[PDB]
Scaffold this motif. Sequence first.
Motif, PDB file in Angstrom:
ATOM      1  N   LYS A  37      61.922  32.245  -2.571  1.00 54.41           N
ATOM      2  CA  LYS A  37      61.224  33.045  -1.518  1.00 54.41           C
ATOM      3  C   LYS A  37      60.046  33.843  -2.113  1.00 54.41           C
ATOM      4  CE  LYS A  37      64.057  37.433  -2.070  1.00 54.41           C
ATOM      5  NZ  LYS A  37      64.996  38.357  -1.395  1.00 54.41           N
ATOM      6  N   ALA A  38      60.024  33.982  -3.470  1.00 57.03           N
ATOM      7  CA  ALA A  38      58.957  34.735  -4.182  1.00 57.03           C
ATOM      8  C   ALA A  38      57.603  34.053  -3.965  1.00 57.03           C
ATOM      9  CB  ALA A  38      59.306  34.817  -5.712  1.00 57.03           C
ATOM     10  N   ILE A  39      57.612  32.714  -3.884  1.00 58.07           N
ATOM     11  CA  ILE A  39      56.386  31.946  -3.644  1.00 58.07           C
ATOM     12  C   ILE A  39      56.223  31.813  -2.109  1.00 58.07           C
ATOM     13  CG2 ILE A  39      55.140  29.676  -4.049  1.00 58.07           C
ATOM     14  CD1 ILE A  39      57.168  29.271  -6.523  1.00 58.07           C
ATOM     15  N   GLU A  40      55.115  32.350  -1.590  1.00 53.51           N
ATOM     16  CA  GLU A  40      54.770  32.311  -0.146  1.00 53.51           C
ATOM     17  C   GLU A  40      54.386  30.869   0.292  1.00 53.51           C
ATOM     18  OE1 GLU A  40      51.359  35.184  -0.099  1.00 53.51           O
ATOM     19  OE2 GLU A  40      50.232  33.734  -1.229  1.00 53.51           O
ATOM     20  N   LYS A  41      53.561  30.186  -0.558  1.00 57.43           N
ATOM     21  CA  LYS A  41      53.050  28.817  -0.255  1.00 57.43           C
ATOM     22  C   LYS A  41      54.102  27.719  -0.573  1.00 57.43           C
ATOM     23  CE  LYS A  41      48.063  30.201  -1.147  1.00 57.43           C
ATOM     24  NZ  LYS A  41      46.880  29.902  -1.998  1.00 57.43           N
ATOM     25  N   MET A  42      54.600  27.085   0.499  1.00 63.81           N
ATOM     26  CA  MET A  42      55.566  25.963   0.425  1.00 63.81           C
ATOM     27  C   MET A  42      54.886  24.724  -0.216  1.00 63.81           C
ATOM     28  SD  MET A  42      57.470  26.529   4.169  1.00 63.81           S
ATOM     29  CE  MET A  42      58.981  25.565   3.835  1.00 63.81           C
ATOM     30  N   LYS A  43      53.565  24.574   0.056  1.00 65.62           N
ATOM     31  CA  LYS A  43      52.758  23.430  -0.452  1.00 65.62           C
ATOM     32  C   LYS A  43      52.716  23.421  -2.002  1.00 65.62           C
ATOM     33  CE  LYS A  43      49.732  23.286   3.804  1.00 65.62           C
ATOM     34  NZ  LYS A  43      50.247  21.925   4.145  1.00 65.62           N
ATOM     35  N   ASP A  44      52.617  24.640  -2.622  1.00 64.87           N
ATOM     36  CA  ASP A  44      52.579  24.769  -4.106  1.00 64.87           C
ATOM     37  C   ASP A  44      53.935  24.298  -4.704  1.00 64.87           C
ATOM     38  OD1 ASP A  44      51.277  25.876  -6.626  1.00 64.87           O
ATOM     39  OD2 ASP A  44      53.019  27.148  -6.579  1.00 64.87           O
ATOM     40  N   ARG A  45      55.050  24.680  -4.044  1.00 64.99           N
ATOM     41  CA  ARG A  45      56.414  24.243  -4.472  1.00 64.99           C
ATOM     42  C   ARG A  45      56.565  22.716  -4.330  1.00 64.99           C
ATOM     43  NH1 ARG A  45      59.768  28.840  -1.057  1.00 64.99           N
ATOM     44  NH2 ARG A  45      57.833  28.874   0.076  1.00 64.99           N
ATOM     45  N   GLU A  46      56.065  22.165  -3.190  1.00 68.45           N
ATOM     46  CA  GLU A  46      56.139  20.699  -2.937  1.00 68.45           C
ATOM     47  C   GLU A  46      55.265  19.946  -3.990  1.00 68.45           C
ATOM     48  OE1 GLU A  46      54.274  18.979   0.688  1.00 68.45           O
ATOM     49  OE2 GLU A  46      56.106  17.917   1.093  1.00 68.45           O
ATOM     50  N   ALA A  47      54.053  20.494  -4.278  1.00 64.58           N
ATOM     51  CA  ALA A  47      53.114  19.892  -5.270  1.00 64.58           C
ATOM     52  C   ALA A  47      53.775  19.838  -6.675  1.00 64.58           C
ATOM     53  CB  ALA A  47      51.812  20.765  -5.322  1.00 64.58           C
ATOM     54  N   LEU A  48      54.395  20.976  -7.074  1.00 65.45           N
ATOM     55  CA  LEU A  48      55.099  21.095  -8.380  1.00 65.45           C
ATOM     56  C   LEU A  48      56.292  20.134  -8.449  1.00 65.45           C
ATOM     57  CD1 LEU A  48      54.829  25.109  -8.622  1.00 65.45           C
ATOM     58  CD2 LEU A  48      53.820  23.444 -10.341  1.00 65.45           C
ATOM     59  N   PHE A  49      57.052  20.048  -7.331  1.00 61.51           N
ATOM     60  CA  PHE A  49      58.243  19.175  -7.250  1.00 61.51           C
ATOM     61  C   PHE A  49      57.835  17.695  -7.474  1.00 61.51           C
ATOM     62  CE2 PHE A  49      61.382  16.416  -5.264  1.00 61.51           C
ATOM     63  CZ  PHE A  49      62.578  16.977  -5.745  1.00 61.51           C
ATOM     64  N   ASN A  50      56.775  17.269  -6.762  1.00 63.00           N
ATOM     65  CA  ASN A  50      56.256  15.876  -6.862  1.00 63.00           C
ATOM     66  C   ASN A  50      55.755  15.611  -8.311  1.00 63.00           C
ATOM     67  OD1 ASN A  50      56.672  15.312  -4.052  1.00 63.00           O
ATOM     68  ND2 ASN A  50      54.794  16.285  -3.463  1.00 63.00           N
ATOM     69  N   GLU A  51      55.056  16.628  -8.894  1.00 62.14           N
ATOM     70  CA  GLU A  51      54.523  16.530 -10.276  1.00 62.14           C
ATOM     71  C   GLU A  51      55.689  16.510 -11.288  1.00 62.14           C
ATOM     72  OE1 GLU A  51      52.308  19.925 -12.079  1.00 62.14           O
ATOM     73  OE2 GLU A  51      50.756  18.556 -12.686  1.00 62.14           O
TER      74      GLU A  51
END
Length: 57
Positions: A37-51
């Motif tokens: 929940k510390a990270i506001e942007k879900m897209k940054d978490r999805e980008a990191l997960f895919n990477e």
Amino acid sequence: IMQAKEDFKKMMEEAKFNPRATFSEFAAKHAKDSRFKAIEKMKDREALFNEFVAAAR
């Protein structure tokens, strides 16, 4: 100081999980984690997960 970002990578390399799992399954397990929940942007978490899956394999 990229502290939140470095803490996220340290958790992912130490949380070694099934590489065929999806973000929704992984996030559902760590959804209760304070770092999630510390990270506001879900897209940054999805980008990191895919990477992470592409880099780990």
